[PDB]
Amino acid sequence: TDRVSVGNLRIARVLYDFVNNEALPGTDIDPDSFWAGVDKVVADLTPQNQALLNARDELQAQIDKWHRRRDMDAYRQFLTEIGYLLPEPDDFTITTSGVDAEITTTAGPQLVVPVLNARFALNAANARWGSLYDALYGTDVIPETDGAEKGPTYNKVRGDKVIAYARKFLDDSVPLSSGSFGDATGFTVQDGQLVVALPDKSTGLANPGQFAGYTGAAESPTSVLLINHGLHIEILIDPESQVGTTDRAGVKDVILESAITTIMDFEDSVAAVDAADKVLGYRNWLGLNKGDLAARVLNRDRNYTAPGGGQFTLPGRSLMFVRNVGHLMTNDAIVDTDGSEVFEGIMDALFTGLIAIHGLKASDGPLINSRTGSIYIVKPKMHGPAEVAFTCELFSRVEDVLGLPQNTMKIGIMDEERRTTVNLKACIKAAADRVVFINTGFLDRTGDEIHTSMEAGPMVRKGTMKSQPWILAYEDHNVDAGLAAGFSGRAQVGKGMWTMTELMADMVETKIAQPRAGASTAWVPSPTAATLHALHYHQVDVAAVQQGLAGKRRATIEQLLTIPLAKELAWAPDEIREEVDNNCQSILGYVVRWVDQGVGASKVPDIHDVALMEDRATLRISSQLLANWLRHGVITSADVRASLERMAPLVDRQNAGDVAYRPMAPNFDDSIAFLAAQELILSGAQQPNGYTEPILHRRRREFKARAAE
Numbered sequence: 001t002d003r004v005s006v007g008n009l010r011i012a013r014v015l016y017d018f019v020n021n022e023a024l025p026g027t028d029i030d031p032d033s034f035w036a037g038v039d040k041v042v043a044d045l046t047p048q049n050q051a052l053l054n055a056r057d058e059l060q061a062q063i064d065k066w067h068r069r070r071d072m073d074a075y076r077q078f079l080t081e082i083g084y085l086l087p088e089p090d091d092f093t094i095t096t097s098g099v100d101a102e103i104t105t106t107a108g109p110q111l112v113v114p115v116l117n118a119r120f121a122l123n124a125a126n127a128r129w130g131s132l133y134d135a136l137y138g139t140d141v142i143p144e145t146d147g148a149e150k151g152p153t154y155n156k157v158r159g160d161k162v163i164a165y166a167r168k169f170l171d172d173s174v175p176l177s178s179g180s181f182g183d184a185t186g187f188t189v190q191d192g193q194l195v196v197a198l199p200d201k202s203t204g205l206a207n208p209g210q211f212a213g214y215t216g217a218a219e220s221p222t223s224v225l226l227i228n229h230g231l232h233i234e235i236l237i238d239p240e241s242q243v244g245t246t247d248r249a250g251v252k253d254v255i256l257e258s259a260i261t262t263i264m265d266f267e268d269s270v271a272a273v274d275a276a277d278k279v280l281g282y283r284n285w286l287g288l289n290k291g292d293l294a295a296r297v298l299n300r301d302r303n304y305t306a307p308g309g310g311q312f313t314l315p316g317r318s319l320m321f322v323r324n325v326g327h328l329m330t331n332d333a334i335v336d337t338d339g340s341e342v343f344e345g346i347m348d349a350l351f352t353g354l355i356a357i358h359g360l361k362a363s364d365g366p367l368i369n370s371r372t373g374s375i376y377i378v379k380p381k382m383h384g385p386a387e388v389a390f391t392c393e394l395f396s397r398v399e400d401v402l403g404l405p406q407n408t409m410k411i412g413i414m415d416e417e418r419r420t421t422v423n424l425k426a427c428i429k430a431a432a433d434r435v436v437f438i439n440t441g442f443l444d445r446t447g448d449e450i451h452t453s454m455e456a457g458p459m460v461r462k463g464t465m466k467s468q469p470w471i472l473a474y475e476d477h478n479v480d481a482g483l484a485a486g487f488s489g490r491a492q493v494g495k496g497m498w499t500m501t502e503l504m505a506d507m508v509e510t511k512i513a514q515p516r517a518g519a520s521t522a523w524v525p526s527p528t529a530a531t532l533h534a535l536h537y538h539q540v541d542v543a544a545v546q547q548g549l550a551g552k553r554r555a556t557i558e559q560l561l562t563i564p565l566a567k568e569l570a571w572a573p574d575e576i577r578e579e580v581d582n583n584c585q586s587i588l589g590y591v592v593r594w595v596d597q598g599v600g601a602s603k604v605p606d607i608h609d610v611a612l613m614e615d616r617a618t619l620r621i622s623s624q625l626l627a628n629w630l631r632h633g634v635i636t637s638a639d640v641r642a643s644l645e646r647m648a649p650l651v652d653r654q655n656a657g658d659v660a661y662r663p664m665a666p667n668f669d670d671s672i673a674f675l676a677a678q679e680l681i682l683s684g685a686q687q688p689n690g691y692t693e694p695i696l697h698r699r700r701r702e703f704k705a706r707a708a709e
């Protein structure tokens, strides 16, 4: 047992103790009133939560039947008739208030990190200011060509390339009145303005307003602060340093404001299947909000002198969101009298919201998240406006339990399910006074696309999906809906993760497409990645881009509804086989770390040994594609078995560097991980909206139980 009785609820003792001892003290909430509200909110909202999941089922059955016995006009008309495609509401503007500047105004990189990893969470929180020299020297952005490779010790030829890259950036972002930063010799602050000594005549900024401050003596600054497109750049001056001595102006480093916000993830990047796991997560979220999390500690605020003369302070930390789990799953951290597990989304709202109160107070711990008095919650995997409204009502009720003013808890709406995509305007409307972002992505949305039209026929390959008509319309449609609902100057419009964590030259070259499309934020896989992607927001004036796009409708419903069916016999046998192996090793590589080790986010080599940093949604797309090919006779169940068999020892070799790893091959049926992977495929077509959590959670729980005996 080991549970506590609170009305109809039976709470895991480890959760009960954590909340009473760690979470509640200092919030001024009566403990007995807190738990009374938990029981009340759970009893009150559970039936509607269940009603909504049943409605997903009802709609998908109808669509399944439609396809089995079968143009856009009939299809569209059908979706409208069944309650899937809802009417578009009249124009409106969001009324969200109490929102920090990092979100309403500033455009820049956004980091996403598993909350259960204290070390990563700390680095993410501290990633708001990152070294441009480290990011350039340490990655392939500066070509590792002959003579410029990074060896065991510092290479000066490589470093001199790092320095020129940075000077080229400075010229491009904060131009001098005449000449370049490349030829500078010194920096002084004379009568409130920045003076750059060149080797002949000195010069000022072409736009004097880009000078934001300095440190050290005004006559010999230890650093110079600049600003461009709302993001700070800091030039550190120190000829008495490893790098500065070679620098013809004494510049030690260039620091960029990078990850201006971070999402602390409880959902797809973590493996948390029971009370003990949820508490580890909650404890870290609590450490972050208190400002006392340590593993390595949290950065404190940064002090500067204003150009005129007075002292000011800039936040030393990423502004934090938390991503709660979605509406589907239950978790036995709380069960009812009958033994039935409570919905995890309801619990996340209550517990992560309580904890977040600590981030709005200084002692007791030392640090603050939101100055403006908001709590930021990302809600994933919502399907349409009724599900958005339910979330907003959940937050309203939690706010009541916690004694917060209404609309304290803001919502970040992930557009990652088809029924949200096609009803986007109504979804934003349903959250008009709470919404602080919308964003798109590849993995979950493509998995939902596949599952929704499972019965329509064979889908194109996973690589091909990235450039299909439906997904390009999807991306444009999301921005369009945001801007037209007033997001510019008010709420973030965000795009998806760059997964290839080692291919930084490739990221810098191509991810710039995202701000060019009017996204004020985009996801990056690491602090180093945040620093490099920040370069893009200096080249692109996102605010100006968004102003350009307002009033334009770039996507039609037809384009959105365009199912990615393959053309008649698109593939040769070898291409069919490559795709199967690709998807089988995608599944195995991720599942083996999840089930065996409880790791939901890590650098995982793919079939071409490219390091990818993906979350659980990689399981959704890969298992759905294989289920689809199996459903329509593209491949056979023997083909799947054979592929899983071939790829397993390949995955084993990929995990050679791991101490705790236990190999799947040659004995597959003895491996819960392998069996989990096989089940995800063969049972894929039957999972609700193709979600993988039901199978995954069961298999990890099975692993944890066997390991206890």
Ligand SMILES: O=C(O)/C=C\Sc1ccccc1
Residues within 6 Å of the ligand: 112, 113, 114, 269, 441, 443, 497, 499, 524, 525, 526, 601, 613, 614, 615
């Ligand atoms: O990859 C990371 O840095 C952490 C996991 S979150 C995520 C990864 C891939 C796509 C979307 C989200």
Ligand SMILES: [Mg+2]
Residues within 6 Å of the ligand: 268, 380, 416, 441, 444, 617
């Ligand atoms: Mg997702």
